[PDB]
Design an enzyme around this catalytic site. Structure first.
Site, PDB file in Angstrom:
ATOM      1  N   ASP A 124       3.896  18.427  24.017  1.00 32.36           N
ATOM      2  CA  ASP A 124       3.852  19.517  23.006  1.00 32.36           C
ATOM      3  C   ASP A 124       4.402  19.037  21.647  1.00 32.36           C
ATOM      4  OD1 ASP A 124       2.929  21.293  24.970  1.00 32.36           O
ATOM      5  OD2 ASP A 124       4.679  22.628  24.879  1.00 32.36           O
ATOM      6  N   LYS A 150      -3.974  25.749  22.858  1.00 30.77           N
ATOM      7  CA  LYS A 150      -3.861  26.887  23.791  1.00 30.77           C
ATOM      8  C   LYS A 150      -4.569  28.156  23.305  1.00 30.77           C
ATOM      9  CE  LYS A 150       0.916  25.639  25.029  1.00 30.77           C
ATOM     10  NZ  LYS A 150       0.742  24.979  26.338  1.00 30.77           N
ATOM     11  N   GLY A 156      10.189  26.453  29.195  1.00 29.46           N
ATOM     12  CA  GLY A 156      11.412  26.525  28.397  1.00 29.46           C
ATOM     13  C   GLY A 156      12.837  26.609  29.002  1.00 29.46           C
ATOM     14  N   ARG A 169       4.516  22.305  46.402  1.00 33.19           N
ATOM     15  CA  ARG A 169       4.824  22.445  47.838  1.00 33.19           C
ATOM     16  C   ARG A 169       3.983  23.545  48.503  1.00 33.19           C
ATOM     17  NH1 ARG A 169       7.819  18.204  50.274  1.00 33.19           N
ATOM     18  NH2 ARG A 169       9.946  17.952  49.437  1.00 33.19           N
ATOM     19  N   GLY A 226       9.224  23.142  33.028  1.00 32.54           N
ATOM     20  CA  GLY A 226      10.567  22.806  33.513  1.00 32.54           C
ATOM     21  C   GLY A 226      10.858  21.329  33.762  1.00 32.54           C
ATOM     22  N   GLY A 285       7.366  19.807  27.428  1.00 26.16           N
ATOM     23  CA  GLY A 285       7.466  20.796  26.341  1.00 26.16           C
ATOM     24  C   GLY A 285       8.314  20.381  25.148  1.00 26.16           C
ATOM     25  N   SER A 286       8.696  21.362  24.330  1.00 29.11           N
ATOM     26  CA  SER A 286       9.418  21.087  23.077  1.00 29.11           C
ATOM     27  C   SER A 286      10.862  20.586  23.244  1.00 29.11           C
ATOM     28  CB  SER A 286       9.363  22.301  22.131  1.00 29.11           C
ATOM     29  OG  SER A 286       8.099  22.380  21.482  1.00 29.11           O
TER      30      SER A 286
HETATM   31  O1  LIG Z   1       5.551  15.132  49.891  1.00 30.49           O
HETATM   32  C1  LIG Z   1       6.554  14.658  50.761  1.00 30.49           C
HETATM   33  C2  LIG Z   1       7.865  14.532  49.996  1.00 30.49           C
HETATM   34  O2  LIG Z   1       7.924  13.272  49.368  1.00 30.49           O
HETATM   35  C3  LIG Z   1       9.037  14.686  50.957  1.00 30.49           C
HETATM   36  O3  LIG Z   1       9.061  16.011  51.440  1.00 30.49           O
HETATM   37  P1  LIG Z   1       9.845  16.372  52.796  1.00 30.49           P
HETATM   38  O4  LIG Z   1      11.331  16.360  52.541  1.00 30.49           O
HETATM   39  O5  LIG Z   1       9.417  17.734  53.290  1.00 30.49           O
HETATM   40  O6  LIG Z   1       9.493  15.330  53.829  1.00 30.49           O
END
Ligand SMILES: O=C[C@H](O)COP(=O)(O)O
Ligand SMILES: O=C[C@H](O)COP(=O)(O)O
Ligand SMILES: O=C[C@H](O)COP(=O)(O)O
Ligand SMILES: O=C[C@H](O)COP(=O)(O)O
Ligand SMILES: O=C[C@H](O)COP(=O)(O)O
Ligand SMILES: O=C[C@H](O)COP(=O)(O)O
Lengths: 257, 259, 259, 257, 259, 259
Positions: free
Chosen positions: C8, C65, C137, C149, C199, C220-221
């Protein structure tokens, strides 16, 4: 100490005023646990140096406070050779589940209680003296009155039970031996003395709690914040001694400042 | 580190005071997270330069903190050759689901725990040390007491279970292997050391936690906020060593000054 | 852009720093939306004059944007000849029901996503690139971690389904064609690149997200608010390139100044 | 007024800027009902003297606002010979149950609506023009977008009903004649024009709402709070006229200040 | 007082302005209860001396207020020979269960009402006039409008009742004699005049309430807070008289000044 | 005392004003409890020295207050030889379960009551006089009115009961002997006098409570906070005597100054 007054003191010179006024004992403490309890601070055992300096200033017995459940604070205070230890709810609790195993010490303990079940648990753990919890620092006597009235009522109510199996059920709920409860019901009183404490502010208050059946009174730092500490201390002592004499109570209550 | 005191330090000169007072190790940190947690700031791993300047100043072992789940912060600290890593709840968590896979590092980790289930999950992930969570920065010992009491109690309660099926049920709820739980029940203790931490303020507090069965003590920045830091640090070290000698405990607690 | 950092920038001179530090592209914006979120203000497309002035200053790609659902802002930015459009949740949304029909444009779009359903809806609408939403931010990396995840967990969960009718039911709930979901479950990944965003504050944060499977990094900034912007920008670029080298990550993370 | 822009003005000189920029009409008002609505004040009809002073400054039509349900404010404004009356939710409502009987007046009325039922009730009462409610003074276009999208969706959804008895049930819930609803479903649109209003801030916003199917736009006092009011007003007019031309929209949006 | 305006006045000089402007009566009060209701003060009957000084200054009728239920305040005011008493909800109530037994006084009373039931209870107790409650001191006409609309509506709804048993049921709920309710239903109106009050700010507001079927208008201290009090008072009087003449209403509403 | 006014006084010179104005008795107090309620303070029996100094200043009866349940405060005040004791809810209660055993004293007591059950419990305990509770220090008469109305309503309601078993059930619920309740239902009144108290601010207020059936009036420190205390005190005494004379009530209520 039956029939006597115990006074909170923060300096050796305060201890000397207490002794001259006719106090039975003093409670040594470095900070008033009502000023900084409204500051958010943690309140602990006082420095052994300040306690010893008070012990060296008077001939009457000296008591000191420890946190609820802090058995090491108690070991240190016992080694210092104080006369009594108060395991006190006014300090910041160290263990919210277990109180001190008081029957492992030589020095006697005082504990607070607000009802019959609490009083018996403290005695079962080893307390040698009970006192009201009250409400400390406020100067409102109503708390202390509530606790003495409640203990008296609960003893009388258990005495009306005719079934020994019902009595055993009560002891089980209280978490105490049935033989301890049965002793209270036979005597119509606790096996140890019960003192008034928390919110005793005037000579009239001290006499009120004695007429209600207490064995003595504890007074706080309010004494030394008055315009004339010597005069007030002496008046509280006289009122505790002569608790059933209206003319004397009038005499000591007049022109207190 | 059995039977020792670990002290939080923010400068090389603080580290030297800790070493002279008899500390077994120091924990290097650039800022106190308790002072920041009241401002809303994000608290991260410290700058490796400040950690190294502390490592250069003492001969005793040095520890440093990383955020929960931040395995790259841990890789950096390991490469720096610090002696121990604290995966710490005091810093701002990086992963709210998964902790670090600690059994994939060479350097030992310490983790916090409030109950038996939590302790066993950290051990299963690879922790080499456990400590109480307590309540950091408050000076109130009661949270540390609660945590040691709870672990001890939950072990005894699980020891009363007569059915092996019920034991397997417990382990499933905890999300740990049944073999780990069974080892604990047979030995009557965790398979690693358990230290006191968070809210240890006075020498009496340190000796209290050792009498409750802790293996050592962590103390915070409160040491260096007292009127006489070297006197207080020495007294805490002496009480942790001589934890069941009342005459010694009275001696070291007398004339301590303003905390 | 794959394997690179997008920065940015609010002025032509900031764009030049980004280019010299090794950025793969820049994102032109007239106001920091995080500063304007605190003021209660409406945040819109930037003035075409300021974007053009940035376009004239560097020889790497430039992105801009637009508000969610604002297809006319997008028509204007396409006519300006920018390289990519970000349909961004950090600006004040224009249509709370419908996103832009991105397949009606020649210029490629990037969109944010917090879970698998969201990612697949944005791709079905025509997005060329996906990124995490994070928390823009605040400098807290945990929200970007949560999103990457989640997407991974939901792919694995759907891979366990044995019934094709059950797969069809999931696609209906997500509001996407069944053929798109099926492709993802076969290959174990999205059909387009997925970048980290929101973040990312430190070099360690950048490498963390690359190790979790991201294809690149947006920052970001915060870069230009630090003590030494050129130093920090260069360190983030180096960490993104060398994400699995602990010795290099230690080198670039040391003595960074205030963040 | 189809395809045009109507601008809020508070002085005769503001009205002259609006006219020179190419506005189709002006809305005369003494106070900005967004400044004092955040002051807690009651907002009413403007003074007929200030409205007349604006009428005398320009050749294009002039509109004025009245409170919801205040039929006497409307009688006064009609006697003044304004070109249109806006029964406006931005002023403080006078009757929270009944709107004005607009079919008792000669002068045409504009009313706001956020869905199909509201639009049809306003038309049934006598409104000659509908506009979005939006959210006035904020500069956030999303409200106006929501209302045009909602009206369009509800017309299409009613068109899918195959039962004439089901259609009658819908009209009854809306509190309008079944013959009015049936007319909308046959034409696929409202019987009157529908303008964009509330939160239109930029030339891009004006073109967005025209591409969504609105017949014109209302703009507020935001125009005259910008660094260059003449330039911004002219750009909004050009964007409304050339709403489907990206190159022109880029031209007028560049270097606006 | 049919077709007239009653004005609140706090001094003898204010009363003279009201009389010159064409007011039909004045209401004497030592303080504005709206200004006090925001401080927590108890608002009572005014000092009889201040009321008498106003009575001495004008030849038109004079009204004064008493607290709800305070029959002794009313006995004092009657002995003073004021022309009308307002048992007023604006003052601090003296009795929260029972209103004054008004049919035991010689002097006529006015009372407030928000619905048909409330109006009939006040009439049954002996009120000679009814008025809307509105919302005093706000300048917002909408509460007065609500009250006149509700009374009119509830009369029409009760007129649709075909069963005399159902009518008796309604009267029982209202706590009034059935003969009183029946008289209202046959006549289509209350047996006494009903004035507008609370929130009347402009000449247009006064004419609005007369077109809705009110018999006259009460106005408050707002008159004397305007830039030109005599001009505003005269205009309100003219609009209440000429309430259905649009050319006259335009004339009196033009160039009024700051309210 | 019947038909008279009792005035609160804080100095000997205030007691002299009360006597000269025609009060039937004075109530001696060292602090205004309403001023101390705002300070969060505990309010107790006054110093016997200040009470005696007031006793020496006048030749009308003197009353003093004690906390609810504080039988030792009462023993002290009896020994001082005051004329009456007020067991008062305005002071901070000492016993939240039990009131004083008043029949063990020679000196007469006055107690407050808000309903019939409360009045009968206080009489059964030994009270010689009852008074309303009201709302002390606020100057709002409505709470005293509520209490007198309630007691009257509850007597009438119980008078409708046909069954003696039903009467016995009411007495059991009230915690009083059935003979006491029966006496009240036969005679239509309490067996002792009932005075007005709490919130009596004006001469009109005093006469209102006498017309509602009270036997006399208590007034608070508001008398001595007015512009002309002697004038106001005299007017309240005259209104209590001449409570059913409207011309006299007008006379004494006029030109009273600020209240
Ligand atoms: O994507 C796997 C990560 O590097 C480690 O994740 P984990 O602590 O659930 O094994
Ligand atoms: O200990 C009994 C007290 O002296 C009086 O209390 P009481 O009201 O229960 O009789
Ligand atoms: O480890 C046990 C402690 O020393 C004593 O605690 P406890 O007797 O309250 O259970
Ligand atoms: O009026 C239709 C708009 O131009 C585009 O909206 P849409 O996403 O429903 O196609
Ligand atoms: O009295 C009736 C009014 O003049 C008109 O009101 P309405 O048509 O909304 O019911
Ligand atoms: O005690 C009777 C009062 O003087 C009047 O009360 P009331 O309005 O209920 O009749």
């Amino acid at each position: 100490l039956k029939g006597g007054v115990i006074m909170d003191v923060v300096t050796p010179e305060q201890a000397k005023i207490a002794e001259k006024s006719g106090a039975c004992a003093v409670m040594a403490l470095e900070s008033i646990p009502a000023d900084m309890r409204k500051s958010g601070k943690v309140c602990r055992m006082s420095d052994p140096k300040m306690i010893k300096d008070i012990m060296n200033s008077v001939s009457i017995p000296v008591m000191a406070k420890v946190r609820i459940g802090h058995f090491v604070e108690a070991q240190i205070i016992e080694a210092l050779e104080v006369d009594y230890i108060d395991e006190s709810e006014v300090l910041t609790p160290a263990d919210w589940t277990h109180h001190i195993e008081k029957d492992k010490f030589k020095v006697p303990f005082v504990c607070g209680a607000k009802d019959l079940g609490e009083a018996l648990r403290r005695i079962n753990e080893g307390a040698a003296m009970i006192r009201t919890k009250g409400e400390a620092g406020t100067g409102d006597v109503s708390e202390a009155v509530k606790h003495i009235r409640r203990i008296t009522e609960e003893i009388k109510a258990c005495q009306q039970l005719k079934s020994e199996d019902d009595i055993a059920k009560v002891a089980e709920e209280m978490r105490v031996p049935v033989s301890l409860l049965k002793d209270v019901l036979e005597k119509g009183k606790l096996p140890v003395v019960n003192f008034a404490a928390g919110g005793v502010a005037t000579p009239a208050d001290a006499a009120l709690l004695m007429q209600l059946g207490c064995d003595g009174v504890f007074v706080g730092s309010g004494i030394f914040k008055s315009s004339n500490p010597v005069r007030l201390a002496t008046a509280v002592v006289e009122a505790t001694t002569h608790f059933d004499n209206p003319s004397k109570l009038l005499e000591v209550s007049s022109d207190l400042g």
